[PDB]
Ligand binder design. Structure first.
Ligand SMILES: Nc1ncnc2c1ncn2[C@@H]1O[C@H](COP(=O)(O)OP(=O)(O)NP(=O)(O)O)[C@@H](O)[C@H]1O
Lengths: 650, 114
DNA sequence: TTTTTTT
């Protein structure tokens, strides 16, 4: 409600006096209305009755009796014979508690400025008006020192302001306090004028003995010093001195650290509790970054929401795969520690990639999502003192997507383990110091052919997920093929640029995040989808070349007198891999311990020369050459016009 | 100790590819051993470059000393001890050359003087 | 501190 508006410190000044009033006005009709009438006589702008509602009880005297007091305030605001001044309010405050009244009024802005003026004979300096400005404007601005050692200003943005779009109810960064400078030459000038009038009143008093010459000297000196408010160097010195008063010591390091708060175009979205709420009023959460998308609650009757849900049904035909992909993409709005997962999307031609992943990126914005290049995953890493500015593009963001594949790229598994696990990553920002941060990103890679996984350890395969698109988008040549559908170019040209479509998709993402938090305990491994698991299993078995070599080249041989040791089969694997993907020089010791388990452990035996003397299992080492014996060693409901709420099985 | 024994590739090469051939006239200068060990290391261990001289000193400091002798031309030679040069193909005679508590209540604290 | 140029 902002009962004490930050643009008017006299509301806070008057609220202190209303607290200072005796509690006999609390829970009573007549004198409460008398003070309301007096306060409306002094200033009728809905401020002092709001302060009455805040400090004391709003309607405890009569529930539903607000409108009677509103009508009384209206009658006070109209022409009123009686006109009670504010001096009656000061008289009542002094009557209730004189010492408390005095102690309350020493901390006001006018008393601080008047004390400075009287104690320094009208000579005003930088720290004095900096202190007054901090007293009257200290809740709207903040100062902190960044990593480079510079003092940076931050301003809280209110609805009525020349504001960049999406900045409301947040802290915006300022290289200079633009508003404070104007405030000094405007609002502060007004209070200076009030002090001038007070000095004129004290001049209008009788001469007494010698105080009148002192008063004219004070008036002359203050009139000389009053012009310094509009001087550029004086204002610069005032702002420089105000940096030590507006300073908050741990503001920048706290600035975007709550992962349950998300800056959005109409305020701050809080996903701490279900349902998620929209803070569009004053608050104390430090929020700087935001997205341009405004948060509206999820409503399927919206035409854009209906269009987007139909599009989602078009892109992914399987219901369980659609639910899993939506649950996975919903975790992109969270910027905390999440599970070590990675999704690979494979599509032949015109598919839903670059529409869905780019939609997530555009609804999250530049601060919360980013597009990443495939050189971070495929090429070998650089020496860490080089400032990799592409690796710094996932510091404080919860979503990342790769989009480029040259020709069946082979990804570096060390980079995969580095960029997926919930741990710390060390890298150097360009022209900056080497630093460590936390991995909080949900990652999706879209490919056109495939990815080659060289390793077969449990570490890289417990964090890899694979999906293949089953829908081809060919509008002109759309045959009876069910998986074949006619396309609209608008989805890539107009719908992805439309703010209403982005708002609807963000609402869908928030709804699916809440669904994941409700049905499961936010854990995505409990999402039971057989299609994704089966596709990952098939992809893993395709990438595992050990079993393919053992089933293809190694055959059962009855009564075989030939002896095949580990160097022979390692060289056979070397020539097989020469006929496979690429040259791929490897380590023979690790290949020996890797085929140590394999599936030949049943037939493998020990040698007197502490070696491996595996008998039988003659390799073909050519094409065909079939064994005359036998055997092989390698042992060779859809949603009913409704979804996004489906949960009979869970 | 087990890891240091398993990381000694020269001992493994001598055990695997060098066998005590009795009454063998096979002449094996350090260069032959260096080449054989280099292939053995690259084939069994990770392929990597080797220093011929350093390798000669390495193989020199081993059981080879027993069967390693100077030549009339002052050249290190391995008397007999035919090398396998391939899988099996070992000398049966004279066999090969390469020899072939409980926490009770709390575990954080223990015997100060075991 | 980068660009570089390490190569
Ligand atoms: N649900 C949908 N319904 C109709 N048309 C769609 C839908 N999703 C995408 N399209 C269209 O499909 C076309 C293919 O574009 P795009 O999605 O970028 O292809 P892509 O597979 O992602 N990338 P690429 O395979 O290299 O061409 C675009 O013109 C979209 O407008």
């Amino acid at each position: 409600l902002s009962i004490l508006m930050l643009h008017d410190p006299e509301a806070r000044y008057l609220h202190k006096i209303l607290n200072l009033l005796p509690p006999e006005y609390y829970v009573e009709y007549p004198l409460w209305s008398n003070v309301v009438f007096a306060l409306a006589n002094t200033s009728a702008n809905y401020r002092p009755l709001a302060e009455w509602f805040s400090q004391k009880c709003p309607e405890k005297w009569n529930t539903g009796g607000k409108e009677k007091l509103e009508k009384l305030w209206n009658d006070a605001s109209h022409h009123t014979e009686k006109k009670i001044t504010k001096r009656s309010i000061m008289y009542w405050a002094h009557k209730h508690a004189p010492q408390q009244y005095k102690e309350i009024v020493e901390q006001g802005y006018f008393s601080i400025l008047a004390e400075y003026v009287y104690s320094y004979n009208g000579m005003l300096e930088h720290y004095m008006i900096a202190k007054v400005i901090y007293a009257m404007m200290g809740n709207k601005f903040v100062v902190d020192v960044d990593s480079n050692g510079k003092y940076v200003w931050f301003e809280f943005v209110l609805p009525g302001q020349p504001m960049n779009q999406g900045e409301i109810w947040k802290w915006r960064k300022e290289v200079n306090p633009d508003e404070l400078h104007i405030y000094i030459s405007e609002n502060f000038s007004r209070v200076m004028d009030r002090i001038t009038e007070h000095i004129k009143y004290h001049l209008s008093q009788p001469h007494e003995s010698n105080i009148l010459n002192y008063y004219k000297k004070l008036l002359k000196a203050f009139e000389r010093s009053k012009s310094k408010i509009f001087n550029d160097s004086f204002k610069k010195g005032v702002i420089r001195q105000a940096e030590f008063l507006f300073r908050q010591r741990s503001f920048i390091q706290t600035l975007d650290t709550n992962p349950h708060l998300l800056g959005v175009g109409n305020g701050v979205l809080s996903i701490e509790t279900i349902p998620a709420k929209l803070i569009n009023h004053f608050h104390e959460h430090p929020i700087h970054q935001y997205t341009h998308i405004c948060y509206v609650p999820f409503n399927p009757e919206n035409p854009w929401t209906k269009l987007l849900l139909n599009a989602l049904q078009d892109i992914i035909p399987e219901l369980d795969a659609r639910l899993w992909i939506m649950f996975y993409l919903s975790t992109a709005i969270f910027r905390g520690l999440k599970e070590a997962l990675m999704l690979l999307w494979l599509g032949g031609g015109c598919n839903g990639k670059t529409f869905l992943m780019r939609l997530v990126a555009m609804v999250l914005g530049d601060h919360y999502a980013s597009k990443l290049n495939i050189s971070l995953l495929t090429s070998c890493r650089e020496t860490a003192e080089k400032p990799n500015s592409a690796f710094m593009r996932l510091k404080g963001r919860g979503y990342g997507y790769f989009e480029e594949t040259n020709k069946s790229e082979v990804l570096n598994t060390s980079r995969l383990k580095e960029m997926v696990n919930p741990g710390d990553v060390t890298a150097r920002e360009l022209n900056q110091k080497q630093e460590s941060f936390q991995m909080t990103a949900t990652m999706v890679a879209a490919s056109n052919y495939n990815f080659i996984i060289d390793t077969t350890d449990h570490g890289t395969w417990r964090r890899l997920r694979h999906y293949r698109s089953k829908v081809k988008f060919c509008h002109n040549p759309d045959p009876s093929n069910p998986y074949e559908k006619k396309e609209d170019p608008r989805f890539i040209h107009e719908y992805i640029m439309d703010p209403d479509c982005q708002n609807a998709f963000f609402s869908i993402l928030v709804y699916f995040w809440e669904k994941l938090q409700k049905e499961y305990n936010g854990q995505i491994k409990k999402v039971f989808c057989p299609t994704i698991e089966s596709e990952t299993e098939a992809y893993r078995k395709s990438q595992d070349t050990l079993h393919r070599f053992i089933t293809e080249r190694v055959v059962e041989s009855p009564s075989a007198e030939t002896v095949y040791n580990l160097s022979e089969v390692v060289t056979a694997y070397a020539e097989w891999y020469n006929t496979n993907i690429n040259v791929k020089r490897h380590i023979a010791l690790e290949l020996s311990q890797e085929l140590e388990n394999s599936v030949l452990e049943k037939y493998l035996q020990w040698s007197p020369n502490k070696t491996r003397i595996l008998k039988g299992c003659r390799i073909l080492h050519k094409f065909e050459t079939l064994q005359p014996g036998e055997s092989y060693i390698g042992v060779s409901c859809e949603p009913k016009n409704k979804w996004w709420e489906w949960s009979p099985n869970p």
